[model samples]
Every structure is written in structure tokens, then in C-alpha cells.
Target chain A: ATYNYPEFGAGLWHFANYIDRYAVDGYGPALSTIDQINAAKEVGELSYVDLPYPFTPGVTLSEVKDALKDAGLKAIGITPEIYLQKWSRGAFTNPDPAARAAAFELMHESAGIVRELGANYVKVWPGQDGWDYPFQVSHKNLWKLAVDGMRDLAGANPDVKFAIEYKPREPRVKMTWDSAARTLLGIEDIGLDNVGVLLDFGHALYGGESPADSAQLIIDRGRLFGMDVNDNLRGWDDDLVVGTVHMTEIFEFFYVLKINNWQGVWQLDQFPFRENHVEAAQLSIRFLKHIYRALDKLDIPALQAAQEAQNPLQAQRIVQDALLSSITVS
Target chain B: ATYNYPEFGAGLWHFANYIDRYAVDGYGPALSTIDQINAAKEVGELSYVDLPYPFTPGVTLSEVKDALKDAGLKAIGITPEIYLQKWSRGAFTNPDPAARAAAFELMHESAGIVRELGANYVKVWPGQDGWDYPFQVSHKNLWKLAVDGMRDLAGANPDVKFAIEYKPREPRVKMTWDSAARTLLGIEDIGLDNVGVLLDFGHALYGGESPADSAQLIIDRGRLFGMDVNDNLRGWDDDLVVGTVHMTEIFEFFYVLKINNWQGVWQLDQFPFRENHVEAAQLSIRFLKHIYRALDKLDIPALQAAQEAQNPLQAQRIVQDALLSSITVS
Candidate 1:
């Protein structure tokens, strides 16, 4: 998994409401096909389609894409339910190599859809990639197979970039940066440089990683390609309102992204449970702006000056001490 | 201040959300008359009323009691506005003892209301109780005035118990348990035994204090009279859905409570921003029950066995390692 959590781009339908019911006829077609895009467009953000696995047999994936394009919506990510289920099956620690390979094969097939639908990246989130008990699985080899499988998928589709969406095992077992790094290395191992990461701050937050710090880590590892800006209710995957939960963390995250000069889609991956979906997205944008302003309040120049002067600790002190310094962050 | 955060309890109408707007006229009426308690049938365990400081006038004290009782709730605690507005007016660490006494008088007037309402405790949150700019405020007399003022209140109402709720501040200043404890010891200076401590887990969590350990510290000290049971989003006060953010920390809090045979209210003090208010309360209840069940699974005898045998960490080995433990948890 390579995505930051609160896959703010994808929306919060999974957390607050049931995903299975979408398989039903009217609701199914409404959510799965072009109508979903039309509904999503009203909220005003870059559009993306989430093809949750196990839709009825009659609903062709091609038709879904055709409808999306016809509706002027771009396909952003492919979310397969099997992957989510498999990763979170606690007893199953490592994925079977052949089965993993087959999953990728299906993914490769899905990539053609991504290409046809005018999407550059296919987001693979093996949410079921964790073990509840400590020391339960061969964490190393399991990752190796996962990476190898992902690499195969990447190799199959030369034009389309295969990015991963990661979580530290709510749906999956353990989707940490280290595993994400290995997955990236697996891409490197398979010689597919196009494979990159979709950093989701919400996922990292749940994994006990600082959203700001983890973003820096993903960027540092050189696999950073895209970002998913969403909020975690302080790490529990409640998918609660974005701005209300992790204001400070998101503030720091935006600060770090601004510092890095990151220019990616500030996707809206919120599950506005019982609240207006449009309202949640609007508030999330408002919150992102607030965080941007908060970062603007940081004294980066003084911090950098301290670092350049070989007194980084002094920089820390200055930051903590609330000394007046200059830095345009927002 | 006295109102429940966002989870199970209704916080201040204006500061958080005006849930009563569905029934009442506006936010002002809701907050001003929050102390009132009638009997509304739909308001169950989920419909808890935590009082907030009123920003608007017009609703008198009688209105407060009538509104709450009519809404099927009771005043759990009394939170005064004096401590909140104190820093802006002047520090509680006022050198003039008379001025400090006056501050206590305001709190005492509020406490008298709480006492009249049959409220169990008066919660004093020292939000303006600390310094954000690193030791900018004089710490020596801050506790002196705070505790002295509290003592004066405690003396005024021997029938009422005063619970000092601490915070690591934002707007007015900085705060922590140590500052709270200092005030607690200071309150003791007035030789009034009616004063006790309100351990706000979220506040303590942000200040690098282990919630359970902090609870234990106060409990062992004969001062742990009540708790503002809410989860901190680890560092900042995300005020997450209770028992959802950190299972270990929350479970530990429950464990300590059960161990102490404590029969206090586990208030769901959180603000559900985008979540369905009704469902959020339901989920919080679900999680609380889950925690209770998890605690039911604890092998107390085995834990003690390991402790007595000096077996390497009872929690790591005996408690967490067994199948029964998993059964209890799962």
C-alpha cells in the first residue's frame, strides 16, 4: 500500500456506511457507473472513480469506464475489495506467491481500463496485509512476494504508473512505510521505475506515524509521486470529519508539503457520515487552507538559519520558545 | 467547560454544535439554560448534557435547570467562566490575595448553582493556567492564587465537592497535570476537604502523561474523584471518539477503573464533526462495550502470577500471549 490514509481523494463511504449494499440494482448502478461521477462532480474536486470489487456480474468494467469518460470524469484509482479482505484476514499473514501474481495479473488487466479512462495511476491498496498477533508471520518474505507481484503489474503496464495505497492494517495486516519501502524496492527490484507512492496521511496517522513526518519520509525515499490529503480521527479509521479531527496534524502535514513544494492533487478522501458529502469536502478545503495559514505562521527562515549555522537544537529551541522569526509558510 | 465534548455528551451549544436546535429556538437558549434538567424521553444514555459557558445572555439560572431537566439530563459538573476569562483580565497568580479571593467568589457563585442543581462536582479548568512562550509566566504564585481561590469556593459550599479539571492550554495559556496538582496541593492549604481532582484524560494525554498512570497517580493520592473520559488524538486534543484512538491507553484507563471498582460515568466527551451525531454516539457506546468485554477477558490471576514469579512482563507474556486473551479481545 503506498497511499496516505484518509485517502481523502476516495471519499468516506466505506467507513460510515456499508459498501456491500452498493451491489444492489438501483443503488449499485447509481454508485458504480456514470451517475456516481455526476454525483461526485457536484462537490467540486478533481474526479476519480473507485471500482469496488464484487459489483454484480452484469455491470461490465468497460461500460463503467465508458460512462465515466462520457460523463467527463477521469479514473484516478482502482479499489478492489478482494485485496482489502485478503490483507485484513488476520490468520493469513503473507500472501501466496501465485495468488499474489494472479492478483497482479488482474491488476494489469485493470490498468488497460485506467489507460482507456485517461487515468495515469492505478492505486493498489492491499488493506488486508497485517497480522494481529506479534511475531505471527514472516514479515520479510511476505513483503517480498507482495512487492514482486506489484512489480509484475507495473512491468505489464508500461504507460500507466502503478502506485500503491497503504494502511497499517485496519483492512490490511500491516501497511507500514518499511513495507511500502520494500514494495517500492520491489518495483526497483523488478526494474519498474514508474512505480511510485500515493501518500495518505490518514493511514499513516493510524499506523502511529506523524502525517507530516511520514510525508517527508515518503518524499525522501524517492517514491513520492502523489498525495491523498485527508484527516484521521487521531489515527482511528473512523473517517470522521476531516478538519474537526486532526487540525494540528493536517496543519503540520500541509506545512511539510508546502516546504517541499509539493504540487499534487489535494484529493478529498472523506466519509462524511450522516453529514452532507459536499459540506464535508468544502470544510476539508477550508481546513486545508487554515492549516496552510498555520504553516505560514512558522519561522522557517530562522529555523533554516539555525540549521545552517550548525545549531539545529537552537532552531528547535527558537521554534519552541515562540521567538518572533520570519518565514512565509502558507 | 462542563458540557460533554462531542462523543456521548452535548458540549456547549455555541462552542461545538447546537444539537438542541432541533427542539429549542437557538444556541443562546441551549447554552444559557444548560444547567436545567427536565425529562425528555428520546434523550437516553446518548443524550447527556455537559454544560458550557454561555456567550449570550437572557436565559437565567431557572431556565438552565428547566431546559436540562426538560431535555432529560442532569448537571454532572459545574464549569465556571472565570478561569477561562482570567488570563485575559489578569493572571490567576495575582499578587493581591483579595483579587484572587474575588476570582474564587465568581467560581463560588457558579458552584452554588451546581450545588443547587444537585450536581456532583464543580469542574475548574485552568485553561489560562500556563505559558505557551516557555516559562513566560510566573509559576510560583499561579498555583497559589488558583488553589487559594479554589479553597475559598470549597469553604463556601461544604455540601458541594470541587473538582479541578486541568488542561494544556491554547488561547489563554499553557496548562498540565503538574500545574493542576500544584493547585490541588494549594487547595489543601485552605484545609477544606471538599475539594478533589478531575482527571481529564485528553488533557493529560497531550502533556505526555499516560492516561491510566495519571489516573492511578491521582487515585492513589486520594484525589481521583472523577474523570473527563475522552481520548486525545494522541498529542493534540483531537478529542477523538472515545476508546477508538488508542486501544491500549483507553483499555488501560478502563482497567484502572475496574481495578479501583470505580462506578463513575465514562462520559463520551468528543466532537463528531462530520459523523452522524446519533450514530457516532451509538458507535461510541459500541466501543465502550467492547472495551468492557476486553477487560472482562483479562486474566487477573495469571497476571498476578507472572508478577509474583517475576516473569518477564505479564502484559507481554501471559496477558497478551494466550488464546483466551485473544478470544476476550476478538
Candidate 2:
């Protein structure tokens, strides 16, 4: 099977060292932002990278631009690190107004970086913007802050695009923008053309959503600005290499994207906490190529018929024929 | 608001400290089985405890029996530790025959313990019976082993009941008995009268299910042999104090149970890793009592009418009135 593949990209953190609550010493010594860019370049398949702002304190934007050009990479988006220690209480919905304003300043500065780098959008991931316990915060007030804070940010940068990445939970016990439906509801609450969704595949799975269905829902609303792919156990955002534990679901995710003519870079959002970062990226790309071939071999009409009849067994049979075997589309 | 409360129960592990990959040193010093029993007794509200087998090496069954009598607790069930180091590869779906046999032997031994203690059932949670990566196992073969193995175990011990507690994933990247529908399907495949489900509320929530809807589904199938409750962030199984994060959902869950006349022990499966164990249990019981009062104050007919029309806003409004306020039923 032969097909023209779309451009591939990844979050810059995918090439950086990682740490978890257990590994307080970290997985490895932290690499500089330039070092990470070089590592991303070593992957040999990435065309773009999402840059997290405030690159190691003193590293300037010019240095970042030079590093990207030398590595043959372009900035796809700029992610503001608003979920760090200072905003642990929350960034957008922090009870302290001063802390919330500080987060807003950081995000506004990142929007400038997006425009400077000619990136697609500003990726807003308020990871800590949720409550940890019941009665900890007023849900209505917290939600208002989240929605209005995003609306204000987007409204300020009228020409800039903003994408919100939602997760069910993390460092915080519960996140406000937790699920696809809930995020969509919040997006409606925000009511702005510049604001959209940056759907993370693993987050969707972690939050108990069918990523493909989530993609369809976002695309239907004309708000899917950007997306990244990763695999998980459907219980937590372990962020293992893509196409590792969930082959069928990932294939289905891409299948939906292809069918909907969703044109965007196929981006990776992985954490190789114990594995070689470059090797993980390479392995993921290899599987992604296999998915492309399988897509070429798929009988879309027959699968559609099965879906129409609501016969999951028949649908699965059709899917397995393409996914489990190598054949050319006639 | 006055109402008759159901008897309370908890997994003995809830009173013990935990050790995750991060804190390999353990959350705290290990407690003896008897020490754990004493901790459970300190909760003061629990009437039943689900004990894990082997009994801290030298501690005998008679010692355990005496301990329970002293604590005013009854053994609700016996859980064999089939997820320890030896069964890391798997229990029921292990590729090695000896590992599977060993696991089965242990489970069979636990069945004896259940009978000796006059417990309700033997709880089976094959936490390691799933693959970590794509193509790691033939899904069909692995599933067959899981269903057949349980059938064999239940067939051998027809006099005792076996309850399968399903979780989406953990220790293993993925687990075989992952969801209520999937577990129910496997139970149907096994076709054994002695085997049923031990539904965990946190597992249901972590797997992306509305606990109330899951209870209704399981109850309809007549497979919900027993049940337990806990709270999480709708992602991983944090196993925090119940009613701490999800007030509305927990209230709804008990509401469903009440409507269905499901008069069973209201059990807990929590892991208060760094909190005061007794205080955690006390707090959870306090909230549960509040839920009981709220149930009495609820306008069931109005809530049912809202549910029939699929009006979530209206239903939530009705729920908030009962849950957020203190009122009398008469």
C-alpha cells in the first residue's frame, strides 16, 4: 500500500528528560532547551516542535530561532508553562487573584512568542486549574474564572489563536476542563473565534473518551485547532510511546481524522521516562507509517455499512482485516 | 433528616500505608496483619472487613478469628494476593503454565479461608492478567484463558462464591478484567453460577463510568454480588477518602442503590497514603451520613421526571438542593 503522509511533529518535551513523583532525582540530568532541540532533530522525522516558553530562564528567543533553523525544525506552537510550582493552587482559577494575574502575564508573553516564531497558536494547558477536594472551591466561581480568564486572554490577542489542552486530573486531584464534552461546554461559555481545542490523545483516553469520537465532536464544531497523539492504559496518562498499548484505538483516531479531512501535523506527546527519547520517537514514527499503510488498505465503505448497522463485531472484523494484515487497496 | 443507615465495611488495606514506584521506601513502615486489624478496628464505624490472605506469616487463622471478635468486625470476604512479585507476568492469563497453576492454587487456598471465616465470597482481582504493549499477547487467547481459568476455579469450589473485582489498569499497564461490561461479558462466557462481580466505585469512576449508571447496569444483570466505594480524580485510582472529590456522583450512586433495594454493606476501598487513617475513615463516614440524610430529603419524583426528560441541569439543580443543605424529612 502507498500513501502520501502528512507532516509529522512533536512536543519538544518529548525529547527532554523526565521525572515523576517517584523519581524525585529525575530520569536523567536536565538538558538545555538547545540540547532538546538538537535531540528532536536527531529523530530525523520531525518537521515541527511545540516550544514551551521561558526557556531555562536566560535562553533568548534569537538563540531558540537559531537552534530551530540549525535543526531543520519550525515552531508549530508555543506552550506557556503556567502549571508549574508557583501556580500549583491553580493558574486560571487560583483563589489568589495575584497568582491568577501572574499566570495571565506569562500566557500573554507566550502569545508574543507565537507571533514572533510565526507559530500556529498559543497552547494553554492549565494543568493545576482544578480543585483537589470536595468543598475546596466553589465550582461555579472556579468555572467562571476559568472561562472568563481564557476569554480575556483570547480577546486581548485578537489576531492570535489560542488552544486549550484539557486533562481529567494530575498534580491536582481534579481538573476543571476534565473531559471532551465538558471542555466543549466551557469553550461555548468562552464564546470566542480565536479560542479552540488542542486535543491530547492520551488525555482523551485517560478521561474515558473515545479519541476518535472526541475528534469528530470537535471537528463538527469547527474548533479543533491542533492535536497531539500518545497512548495510555485508559486509566492514567502514563504517556507511553504512541501505538504501544492501544493499536486499534489509535488507528481509529487517525482514521477519523483522515475521513474528516482534518489537515494538521501528526504530533507526538510522549514521555520516555526510562527509554531512549530518540528511539521512542523513531519507533512511534515507524508504527505511524504502518497505520498509514493500513489506512490505505481499509475498505471504508464496508466499515461504514457495518457502523450504520451498529454491528461492532462486523466493524471489528473489517478493521482487523486492514490492521492485522498487509494488503494493497484495489 | 433521619434515615436508617446501612452497615459499613472496608478493605483492610484502607487502614494500611501504601508504597508506589516513587516511594519504593514505602509510604510508612509496614504493619503486621494484626496491626492492620487493630487499625481497622480504630475506625469505630466499620462492621465488616475484607481480609487479604496469608496472614503475615506466623499469625494463624485462630489469631485472626480472635482479633476480629475483639474488634467487633466480621470477615466479609477473603482476597488472595495474586498480584505480588511471583505473578508479575500474570495470574490467569500468564504465558507460563506453572505461574497460572500457582495462582490458581493460591486462590483455591483463599477459598478455604473464606469458608473457615464464614465469609461471603473469595474476591478475585487479577491485576497482572493483561498485556503492557501492542501485540504483546493474542487478545483472543488471553481472554479465553481468563474466562476458562475463572470457570475452573469456580467449578472446583461450587460451595463458595467468587467475586471478580475489575479495574481499568495499574501494576500491569493494562488489566484483563477492565470494565463492568467487559467483566459481565466474561462472566457470561464463563457461565458459572458461583461467580459474580465485586463492583468497586473508584474502579468504575477511574474507568470513565458514572458509578450510578454502572450500578444500575450490574444490578439489572443480577451479577453485582457485592460492592465498595472510594473516590478518585476520574483518572488513576488515587483511592482517596470517599465523598472528598465527587459529592454529586457519590450521592447519585447511593441513590441508585436505595431505589434498587440493594441492601448490602456499604464498603470502602481507600488508600489514605499520607493522612490519618482513622480520621480519614471518620470523615468519610460523616459525609456518608450526610448523603443518607440528603436521600431522605430528595424529591425523587421530580428527579425521576428530570431524568426521564434527559435534563441534566434540572436534575443537578434538584440534587444540589438536597445535597448542599441540611433539612429534615418529616
Candidate 3:
């Protein structure tokens, strides 16, 4: 890989056992957090990983830290488990005040780990902070508790940051922090600089948003704290390796990052539910580098002119040439 | 059955064979367009069916008319297959002006068929009228051609009505008229009362809009001229039979109609890919009856107060009793 190639990170869960509602038993034997860290290292391309709180049942921070140190990876974000069964009704937006308080305390603990591990931010993915049924919860109360809860967390921990990784919906029916625009709106109301968005490209893609437009919007808002790259069939967050289904969109997503000079670790929030995790990780990162080379070959100025005209056909003509022909020429 | 119950309709294609990219061979033997109408008739409760243009390679209009009459069915609308092979790039939003014009002529021909059959309107579902890649098309050119082309079509046909069925995306990577908001925006710009929306519940659900919220928004704008009922996993437009997946949201969706007194047909837009089409439609239509029973049991005024407070908990309590317990009590 060229020194010109930027940093790459991943959600540590990508290296662990996979499970689904269909196959609740899981796809493979569950690996401990430390074991997963060992798994991530085998990919070789990973520079950082977003880890979950409470590593394996009794695993200590010292052990995990040593494992990562040996693996030669750094902690990018500490993801709090706020969407589990305990918070099925919701975490921050839970009707029960006691549960809400519990989630707040849980987040606080995750933030502490971030400080101990010297991670970038506390990754807040309160996916259950929404309802499945339409009348199941009040949108008004949901938004309020969600915003106020994050505000309080960020306000109390002024030195730390909270990067909300918003998904459209799963587990729960609807997600409160669903879209980049809606997430940005909540962040605005929260009025705290520490509350930023960790935009996932697949989330935006399936959420009926143009990924390029969303990235630019998030960047423009100055809250694009981080991001993850994966592919889906523009329906579900299939979380397949990048460049498999959407080659041109991947190039477009990276093109925005390049054009804007947005320097942050490109992370993978992919879940290879049925595939080998290490190979999946390797495939994604390599595809990303392929996208990088494709970007290098693109006629930036001409593409810009076509985009300026809002000419999709002209844009296709230019992009297809660069993306399709991108291969190991040597 | 009381006259209080509303008419039920379906997209005639719901009875067609299902196929996918992986199973390109199809799930069953393909049926001609006329065969589909006969299948629609077998659903028993379906009073109307949205027919497609060009049935069976050589089937005549007289043959379709005879089939409909014999089957005791009425034509709700004529769907123009503008998202097929010829319009893969786009229909109205095609970069090629000739293709765009061809789509226009095709639509006009469909409208003519609509008049001949005495159908309600022309169901304009241009699913392919959008870009596949970032910068693949200028969003500007795409929107312009789409709006302008539709505007031109509607302006030319004063007596005929057009109902745009908006999906987030399919066939194309992104859809031009993707969301309720964007479609309404385009309709507002199109500046015609006859041009309206055929809001699909599954489309809204997967597109990250509350189906209830979207329906209300569409109806409030005076463009919710038609609608379809289906369920999804809130990711892809799964288009499964109604009540199969979404019980609560379906209630909420219909609740709005009952609230708004929006008396359009309750139609199923399901695509039972691997299931029996007649059974699928039968299940869906029966579910609507069950929903109607639930709606009867609902304490509307009390629920209204709960919604007024925007208290989801209270609303859920009310809905659960009515929805979960909705079974034949006879």
C-alpha cells in the first residue's frame, strides 16, 4: 500500500461470531474480545478498531490493551452496548426513568474506558432508542430524551466526545437518529460540539440518501466525526464487503472524502454474518484501495464540470471508464 | 358486509411470477398480463386491479375486457411498464431524449388504454428513472427531465389522471421521485391537480419514513390520490403480504385514513416472490378485514387524546388491545 493511502479502521465485532434472528445460535463459536482483537490483526490492513464495552465476560483492560499492542492496532472508538435486551424498549428514550439512568451510567463507563484506552470517542449507537410500532412511542418524547440524554452526557464529560453511529432501523422498528440530516438536527438541538455523527455509508445508502450528498452534508455541518464503509443492495444493510455490489458508489463516496480532504480513519462497520471475518476484512480494505486507485485515475476537473451541469449520463461515462478498468495492471 | 367497509384494490402485477437476481429463472411459471387479472379475481375480495399495458405479446384489449368482465373485476388504473428493458437507464429521466420521448408516448398510450377501460388513472411508476452511481447523472438534469417530462405529459392530458407511485429505489440505484416529501415537491412544481401520488406503505416504511406520517403528509398535500398496503423488514421493499410482518404500523397507516376520512381504495402492492399469488392476496385482503375489526374496537377519541399528548406508551397500550386481540369472534 502507498503512503498516499489513508488510514483504515474497523468495528471489532466484525471479527467475532455472527448471529441473526433466523440463526439465533450464531454462525460460529463466539470469540472473546481479546480473541477478536487477535482475529483483527490477521487482516493486516487494519490500523484501528472500535471496541465494545465490557470486553468478553471477565477480560481485563490490561489484557485487551496488551493484545492490541501486540496486534499493532489502536482504539478508535469504544462502542457502548446500549441496544441489547435490557434496553429493548429503548436506552436513552426508554419510558422508564430507571432504565434511562442505567443507559446514562453505562455510557459514562464506556467513556471512562475511552479515556483509559486513549480512544478517539465514545461510539453511541442507541439503535433501540426508537420504536417498532408507529404508535408504540411518542416521537416527541423520544427525540427529547435522546437529545437531552446525549447533551447531559457530553455536558458532564466536556473533555470527551460522543460519535453517534445512526442506523435507519433494525432491532427496533424506527430509529430516532435515523438519517444524517435528522441526526444533525438533534446535534444542533443538543448544542454541544462533542456530539458528532459517525456516518455509515450503507446506512445512508439504504436510508434513501445519496452517500456522496450525505458525506458532504455531514462534513459541511462539521460533525462528521468518523465514518464506516460497507455495501448493501440499496435495501438492507447487507454489510457485505465494499466494492462487491457498488463499485461506482464506493468510488464516489471516497471521491467526496478526497475532494474535501476529510482526514479521518476510514472504518468498516461490516458484519460478515456468513463469511470468514478475516477474509472479509481483507477483501473490503483491498477493494477500498482499488477504489483509491480508481479515484487517482479519475479526471477530477472534467467530472466536476459534468457534475456542475448535473449531467448523470456524462458523469457515468467518466466514472465507468475509471472504475471498470481499475485492476492490478502490473 | 357493510357499505361502511371501503373498496379494496391491488396492483395487478401482484399475481405475476416472482423472480430475483440470484433466481433469475423465476420462482414459478410466468403468467401473461391477462392471466394476472384472472389471478387477481381469485383473491375474492379484490374489487379493482391496476392493470399493466401490453398484456401477453398478442392479447387484444377485447380479450382483456372479456376476462375482466367474466371475472367480475374493475380496472383501477393502467400501469405503464416504463421501468423495463427499454427504460433501464431511465424513462422520463433518460439522458437520451428519444428514450424519454418514447416513454412519453408509452405513457400517453397507457393513458388512452386507461380511458378505454374506464379505469381511474394512469399509475406512473418510473422505478428506473434515477441514477445508479454518484455523479452517474446530474441530480439537476435528472430532476429537471423528470419533472419537466411529467409536467409536459400531464399538461397535454387534461382529462386523464396520473398517480406517481414513489419508491426509495429499485431497478435503479436511486429513484428520482424517491420520497413523499421529494415527490410532493415535484408535484407542487408540476402544478397540476390531476397529477398525484400513489403512496405505498412498504415504500414509506423502508424509505425511513413513518408510513402513518408519510400517508398523512401525502393526503394533507391533496396528492394521496391512491395507496398500496404491504410489509417489509424496514430495509428493502420486501412487498410481502399485509399484516405478515408489520401489524402495528399497518394499523397506524390505516388509522390515519380513518382519521382523515381519506376514502380511497385499500390496495395490496405485495410481491409474494415464492408464495402462491392468490393465497398471498387472499391473506392480505383478509388481514384488511381483521384490521377493520381492530379499528372498530379502537377507542378513537381516547387514542386521539393520547396522540395529542404525544405519549407513545398510552397509545401503545390502546393499540395492543385492539390490534393483538383482533380475531374472528363469531
TM-score of each: 0.48, 0.59, 0.63
lDDT of 1 by residue, B232-322 (tens): 6656766656644454566667778778776676665565543434445545565565556556657777766766775423342333322
- Give the per-residue lDDT of model 3 (tens digit) for A53-152: 9788999999999999999999999999998888887889877788889999999999999999899999999988777656754444557788899998
Runs off by more than 4 Å, candidate 2: A1-235, A239-330, B1-3, B305-318, B327-330
Write model 2 residue lDDT over A106-151, tens digit each, in one string.
9999999999999999998887788766677888899999999999
Q: Give per-residue CA lDDT, model 2, range B1-330, as digits (tens).
A: 346777899888887665543233355666767888999899889999999887777889999999999999999999998876566667898788999999999999999999999999999998778876767789999999999999999999999999999998875577899999999999899998889899999999989988889899989988888998888877677788888778899998999999999888888888776568888888888878888888888899999999999999999999999998753332
lDDT of 3 by residue, B1-330 (tens): 352667898888898897789999998998987888888888888889888886768889999999899888888999998978898878898767888899999999998999999998999999888866578654444677888999998988889999999888998867888887668767866899889999999998887798786776677667887898999898798888898888988899998888888888888888888888899888887788889888988988777667544467788889888987736661
On lDDT, the stronger of 1 and 2 is: 2
Give the CA lDDT, 0 to 100, for residue B133 in model 2: 71
Residue range with the least summed lDDT across 10 consecutive positions in model 1 chain A: A321-330
Instruction: Categorize the docking of model 1.
Output: incorrect
Against the true chain A, what TM-score does chain A of candidate 2 give? 0.97
> DockQ for all models, in order?
0.03, 0.09, 0.20
| lDDT of each residue in A247-327, candidate 1, tens digit only | 445655676787887766566566554444555565555445434443554678886797687552344333322211111
Best-performing candidate as measured by lDDT: 2
Residue range with the least summed lDDT across 10 consecutive positions in model 3 chain A? A133-142
Off by over 4 Å in 1: A1-30, A47-57, A61-72, A84-98, A172-191, A289-330, B1-193, B198-330
Interface RMSD of 3: 4.8
Per-model RMSD to reference:
20.4, 9.4, 8.4
